Ligand binder design. Structure first.
Ligand SMILES: CS(=O)(=O)Cc1nc2ccccc2[nH]1
Ligand SMILES: CS(=O)(=O)Cc1nc2ccccc2[nH]1
Lengths: 304, 304
């Protein structure tokens, strides 16, 4: 029993983190096979970040200007290319610790683990969600860029995020491992404001199922609702609309608990309208939305 | 910026997890050098757990009855001994992945990372605190016993916890790596009720400093207090008494922020008396107490 915000074990990703330095800028790279992936803004000064022309800045860079260090050992750079907002540094040594891996572009509401790194060294691991406004709420200091987000399915690491930017509001923006930003964000130090940070309804419902499984039951009520009725309330509270696809995804938790998805919606509706009244659910005083239905099943069933 | 509940990177501990089976019981062991450490209740049936005589049960066990598997490779057991509530299984192979390590017995209010495992395979990592009643609020299913808690200082793993028991209230009890339970708990399926789960005041204050550093400032007020006045309010709210030692430990955060510890106490006093009024601090609607002052400094400074 018990339900925690749980990250994936980080060892497979620790074995991929390297330091990348270009001139006076040091950040992290991801070493898979004989390629090191890092944010292209490694080539920028803080001054450059105001209005960078990456193609123009990159002309002044040679392979020997990209210093890549794996632990205390230097890697030889034999090629570089820019793909969207990432650089791919070809090195002459395949990472001997390269796990089975994939690059995946996640959807808003999907969760992942972040291995926060500085100078190519892992500092900590924590669980994130892709917000509906395509930001993440991370923990990233200067030097953390190129830290990655990932999921693990048994022995395959799906890399989904690389850290690039902090917005003036202290939320985070980054790319997939093809270097495409999530959402509208750019790697420039400019006016970039995030949209509404809506609540991931399907994840809240998953977490309420988790709560029932783990004996937190006080919020269960005598009511049901419909998707349309629920959605009128979601809209009012800046929750994401619940779709039949979401109801289908919650089917296994519904089955395990015997609580119909629409009955759990009506519990959530009352919690939104009435608040928690100073009560807690799984140790939280707000409705938690960074567990997916898959996360809840995984943690409640003990997948390794 | 941003402040997350962050675990230590788990790779160094992943490389130490093995499966231990005795008869029909499978749980996890920790393989360091040529010793595998596991809960002594591996020798029990569920029936045995009602009133186990461990010395008597152990007489019926030989080295060859302890099946130890590291990945898909069997380890040869050449000795076993019971130390308090752990078994030490001597194997004929030193763990090649043994990190620098120490065994430490932590104090209530200290935090640590847990690597939740099943069948010797890591499932997830999360951050815990030793509660003032010597329980932890973990995430542990059948098969998770022998999962460990740890801190890392650069390259040295300090192991502080091994998982043994779930209480009927769904909180967790375990031992240090010398097999001594934290608190009054025993490895028997009996009436064991936890005491008051008081709030770790010094950790709340650390987290309020973290909040100020990360731009959450609304709760700062025009008031100060004294330790004695603060402690009258702590007592009323089931907070741990704040000592001068705690004030001293908060000195670096006080210095960084320029907020006197006693002024932050007076902010906490008002939050206790007035509540949050539907506001959040670092994304929480309750006062978080599973960050130590050391955790806040580490995360705010980016230690690897
Ligand atoms: C990337 S490569 O050098 O073209 C081929 C390769 N990929 C590897 C991954 C791990 C170990 C050796 C490996 N050789
Ligand atoms: C424990 S032992 O067999 O007595 C000595 C030992 N400890 C080691 C740790 C890592 C690799 C080889 C090692 N040999």
């Amino acid at each position: 029993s018990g339900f925690r915000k749980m990250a994936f074990p980080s060892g497979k990703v620790e074995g991929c983190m390297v330091q990348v330095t270009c001139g006076t800028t040091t950040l992290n790279g991801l070493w898979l096979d004989d390629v090191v992936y890092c944010p292209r803004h490694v080539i920028c000064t803080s001054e450059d970040m105001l209005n960078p022309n990456y193609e123009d800045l990159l002309i002044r860079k040679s392979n020997h200007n990209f210093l890549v260090q794996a632990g205390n050992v230097q890697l030889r750079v034999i090629g570089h290319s820019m793909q969207n907002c990432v650089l791919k540094l070809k090195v002459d040594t395949a990472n001997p610790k390269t796990p089975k891996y994939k690059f995946v572009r996640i959807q808003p509401g999907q969760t992942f683990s972040v291995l926060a790194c500085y100078n190519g060294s892992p500092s900590g691991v924590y669980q994130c969600a892709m917000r509906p406004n395509f930001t993440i709420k991370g923990s990233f200091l200067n030097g953390s860029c190129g830290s990655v987000g990932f999921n693990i399915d048994y022995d395959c690491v799906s890399f989904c995020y690389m850290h690039h930017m902090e917005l003036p509001t202290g939320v985070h923006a980054g790319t997939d491992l093809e270097g495409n930003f999530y959402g509208p964000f750019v790697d420039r130090q400019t006016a970039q404001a995030a949209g509404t940070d809506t609540t991931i309804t399907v994840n809240v419902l998953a977490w309420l199922y988790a709560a029932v499984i783990n004996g937190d039951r006080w919020f269960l009520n005598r009511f049901t609702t419909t998707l349309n009725d629920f959605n009128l309330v979601a809209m009012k509270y800046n929750y994401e609309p619940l779709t039949q696809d979401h109801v289908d995804i919650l089917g296994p938790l519904s089955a395990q608990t015997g609580i119909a998805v629409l009955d759990m919606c009506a519990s959530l509706k009352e919690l939104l309208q009435n608040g928690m009244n100073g009560r807690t659910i799984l140790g939280s005083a707000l409705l938690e939305d960074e567990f997916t239905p898959f996360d809840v099943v995984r943690q409640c069933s003990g997948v390794t």
